[PDB]
Amino acid sequence: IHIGPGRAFY
Amino acid sequence: SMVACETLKTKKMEVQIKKNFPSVLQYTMTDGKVMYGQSKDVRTVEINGTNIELGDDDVTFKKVSDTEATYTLKVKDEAKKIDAVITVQITVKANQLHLNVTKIKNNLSEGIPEGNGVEENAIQTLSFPNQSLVSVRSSQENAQFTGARMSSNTQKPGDTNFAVTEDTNVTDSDYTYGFISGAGLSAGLWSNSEHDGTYVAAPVRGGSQNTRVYATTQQTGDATSLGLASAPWYYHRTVTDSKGKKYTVAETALPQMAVAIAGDENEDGAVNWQDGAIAYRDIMNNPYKSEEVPELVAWRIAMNFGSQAQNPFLTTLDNVKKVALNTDGLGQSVLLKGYGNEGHDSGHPDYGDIGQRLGGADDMNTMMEEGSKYGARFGVHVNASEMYPEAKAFSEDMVRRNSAGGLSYGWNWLDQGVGIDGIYDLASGSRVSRFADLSKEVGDNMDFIYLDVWGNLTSSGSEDSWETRKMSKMINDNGWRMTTEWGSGNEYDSTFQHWAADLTYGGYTSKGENSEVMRFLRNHQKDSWVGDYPQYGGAANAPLLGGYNMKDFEGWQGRNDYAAYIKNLYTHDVSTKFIQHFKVTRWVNNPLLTADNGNAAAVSDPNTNNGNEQITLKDSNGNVVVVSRGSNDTSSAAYRQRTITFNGVKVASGVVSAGDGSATGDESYLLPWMWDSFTGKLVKDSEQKLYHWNTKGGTTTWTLPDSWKNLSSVKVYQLTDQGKTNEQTVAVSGGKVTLTADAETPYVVYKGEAKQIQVNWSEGMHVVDAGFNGGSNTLTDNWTVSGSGKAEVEGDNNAMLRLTGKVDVSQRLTDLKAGQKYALYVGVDNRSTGDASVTVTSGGKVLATNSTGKSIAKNYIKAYGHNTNSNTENGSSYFQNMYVFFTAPENGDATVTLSHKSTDGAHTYFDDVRIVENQYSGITYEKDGTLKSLTNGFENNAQGIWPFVVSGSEGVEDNRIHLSELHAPFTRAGWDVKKMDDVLDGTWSVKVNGLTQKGTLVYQTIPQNVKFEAGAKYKVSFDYQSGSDDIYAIAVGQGEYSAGSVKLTNLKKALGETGKAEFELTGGVNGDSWFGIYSTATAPDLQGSTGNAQDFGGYKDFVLDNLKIERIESQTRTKAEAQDKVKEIRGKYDSKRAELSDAAWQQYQDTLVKARVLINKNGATAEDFTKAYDILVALDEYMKLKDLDRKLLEAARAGQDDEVRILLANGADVNTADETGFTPLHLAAWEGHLGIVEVLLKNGADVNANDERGHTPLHLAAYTGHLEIVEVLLKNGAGVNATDVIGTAPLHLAAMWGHLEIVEVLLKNGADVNIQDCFGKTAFDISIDNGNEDLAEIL
Ligand SMILES: [Mn+2]
Ligand SMILES: [Mn+2]
Ligand SMILES: [Mn+2]
Ligand SMILES: [Mn+2]
């Protein structure tokens, strides 16, 4: 699942 | 010589009666069997809770005849202010004895003073304590007591069954029904007592607790005697209203009681309550019009809400004809919820106010008169507990007040509901005069009244049986059948309970009547029982008698599935109703009754149905119905297996599909329908029919009824919305028939060829088949199709007209008043880019015309047939009403044409052609067909909030937007805590109630209502009232609404003083321009108001009136000027290609290409050059703001505190979102720019703003590890327990990394540790999975 405007997963 | 007793006698019995008191010694039947009365010298009379024992000189006696005697009782008590003379008559007929109090004389008053004033020393209550009218002894063979109390709980029976032994000890033990059996005789006691007592389960009052029988034990020699007496009666009861005003109200009826002596009435070889119950039916009260209940196969609600007119009366009549065709003419019961005022929960308590937008009293009467021909009964939803300031009945005396002297507030939705003072409403004669107002309108056409919420205590803390009886009387006096909401409510006079018939409501503890005694006696008289709903268990697990299962298809709770409605009628309702045509005679082996629930002496027989449950029912023509349970064990598959026999022949077999819609069954039936749909009399041998249903489908063999045994063949028809179809001739061999059926498909069986039910679609509607219910044939018989394209009747739910290509659909208009003004509107969903039109012509001359391009607004009306949850096409519906206004010609010749111009291939959907008398004359046109001016004061709206349409701020809802009505001073600012006016000019306005902080469109104009020409300029103005500053804004857009494509202008506060708004609009290139009302993200100023004052104050509301849209003169431009403006705009934004989004470039390119088409067309004029220039100016102003917004999102991300301030001061929107939904606040919190976060919030950035993944700026700040930003966001009012699409809170994100102090500040601010994501993980589980033992240590 994505969280930010970049390529950050969680 | 002088004897102390007399004998009253009939052909069936002799009775000894005492001369010194109205007591019976014993009843002797012709066979010699004896039943005792009162063997002891008990002469007690209770008045106003005081017992007075009478002496020999206090009673005088007179024998009138062998069947009647009269008593005069002198009841005096100086100390307790009692001095009365009571006249009592004892009558006997057949096996019945009646004891009636025929006169009550008060020697202490001159009666009730005028206006229901307080009668001092009034006889309020009266009873005969331990009168023992009928009694059983412990010394008698099978001495038993059977009682019933009210139970709405499916797990708790309302019955008690026990043996009368020496240890039996009761004193005024109160029951709704009581039966005593002993020494071969059984008897029940009937009373008209309004006493409320002991009950098993009931969630409300409203006559749920009515106990009419008192059981008492006394010693009779060495035996214990259990005697039955009436519960106390009310006579001249003194009541108090909410203001402390006292009133004396006269009796509903004089005191009455009766007994009926039975032997073995069902000839089953035993004497119990069931025998006494068969006899009891001869003496018991029968609800008014209960005789028609078996005929009401098809119950349903036709819904109207918030000025929308979703179901006008003449549309309801069409739906009645559709259901008649599909049921082969079975009886119907239609509840009109929203018949009055603006619809449902509007205009209460104005019963006489029939909704003018539905067609008023004239169309309501046509529907009722014409519908009666099809066996349809009509009734209206009324409220006697809550009122609205708009209602003419609203007054200071009508208002329910609390101890403090404030309003007793109800619910706020469209308007603020206020509790009615129920005691004042009754005692002043107010309610009875409002019902009289309705009676004057409907005459003898209406069948029932539906009383909502009575018993929930919103009118007063009482709403007892005495109150319910007076209520039921004023309704029944007007020729109306009584129906009510709650399952337990009004046991005495109700024939229907909404929470009984609709099994989905309120759970197992708040259903219909769970009593074997009550359902034995009255199953055939009411729809007030427990039906199938396995989920609830107990009584709801496959009742043998079934029970009504109510569904709807006309908007009630957004219900619109017609196929599901019909399927349901056949699954449960046809057999329930078939069973109700017979009266219960025997009921053995009930598995719900056990020794543990006080039913040790319950009726058992191991020689009947293997000791499993069986019910025997009989009619007056000696027809026997036997209903059997397969097994009495719930863990056995056979518990749900039921066999129904009609005269010893199997007519039904199997398991029904679960009433809760959870599991399909296997039940099949071939039910004989012998009755007409009127008074349910037997039809002729020719008209006799059978209904066939097979749940799973397949082939079944049946024995036909006795009258059918010698036929050689039968005629079988499949039932559809078109009537009888696919006729089959089926052979009869040995009185047996084999039937092949499709799964869940209705069939009707006749002896010979059956005629089609005659239906003339849309009677009184000036057009034939206005709703397209006539099938494919309607386009040949009623409507005329012309053109190269296709016209089709589409939709397997609510049928619509579907057009493709160049096609016209026409029909002549009938019964129009010459010279009279009419509105013609039609539902339209256009998916084609080509114009969909509606035209009214008179001999090839256009009277009025209107058209629409591609539809841009989805329908959000829950109660409407074509809302966006119904799927007109591609999972959506854009249905909206398109109007034409015309004057009917003197000529008498008028035609309606619905048409499509394109050859697009895309569809246009049309439905519900409505021609109605209407005085709206606010539209003026230019020389060319275009708009000059549109004015609207909303005084003449045929329907809805036209020229506006409801938007999706609440999704598909019973939208809190409607036309508000004037009723001064109650609707005006200043009355109570009300700070806003409901109406600004005239009688009507457009009111928005509490739709604040939605961050979306509330309502909008659409091009089919008001067309703005491309490049043309318009002045829009209106009068308004807004609760707070910037809570609502004027929205201006083009095409379908999308967040971030609308021009917004915040409206200032105008609370109690009318504001004036005016702006200019330039029509977009595609002609799809519109304006509307938008709910901003701004919080309302409640001005320190608390509780209901927050909603009634008007701080959260918006009122609009006196709308004026006028085409304005713009500064004339030359081709040169327009060409230079093209160059100017191109010079600015041609380069900016990469900067703006791909959707923004195509919007810029489109507008630029279309403006150049206007400029460079051969023979273009000054108007074309002015339009092209104005389009470019509006394009420039749009692109300028779009650039500023893009620059603001880049300055908030890069960390430029200066640029952010500059851009905000110039014009850039603080709440601008990128493609993925990130606001500048999101970007500032993520990147870590504390100053920028503070700057944006100071300006007014949304702190609870969500991106596409549901992440708020707090989620982004918690994940990254920005303590500073986390704290400043929470300070501003950020949601601490805000969850994204996976249900992840900021607490989970902080636990994921190990941001200890972020977890601390979150927990300090109120972060819930119990919050679970979609995968059931807490913040605790997420910390242990990442290897952070230090975080898990806390909790
Ligand atoms: Mn019997
Ligand atoms: Mn239709
Ligand atoms: Mn007005
Ligand atoms: Mn209203």
Author numbering:
A (entry chain E): 3 to 12
B (entry chain B): 338 to 1676
From the paper:
Here, we show how peptide and protein targets can be reproducibly crystallised as “guests” in a host crystal under predefined conditions, and we explain the advantages and current limitations of the host lattice-display method. In order to apply this approach to biological macromolecules, we engineered a host lattice comprising auxiliary- and target-binding domains; Fig. 1B outlines the design strategy. The auxiliary domain defines the robust host lattice by providing the majority of crystal contacts, and thus also the crystallisation conditions. It serves as a scaffold for rigidly positioning the target-binding domain to immobilise guest molecules at well-defined positions.
EngBF-DARPin construct L1 has a shorter shared helix, but the molecular packing only permits binding of small targets. To test if a single disulfide bridge stabilises the DARPin and allows target binding, we introduced mutations Lys1655 → Cys and Ser342* → Cys (*refers to a symmetry-related molecule) between the DARPin C-cap and the N-terminus of a symmetry-related EngBF domain. To show that this strategy works for other small ligands as well, we inserted DARPin_D12 that recognises pep2, which also comprises 15 amino acids like c-pep1 but lacks the D-Pro-L-Pro unit. Again, crystals were obtained under the established conditions and the ligand was visible in the 2.4 Å resolution difference map. Here, residues 1, 2, 6, and 13–15 from pep2 are not resolved in the final ED map, suggesting that internal molecular rigidity, conferred by the cyclisation unit in c-pep1, is required to resolve the target completely.
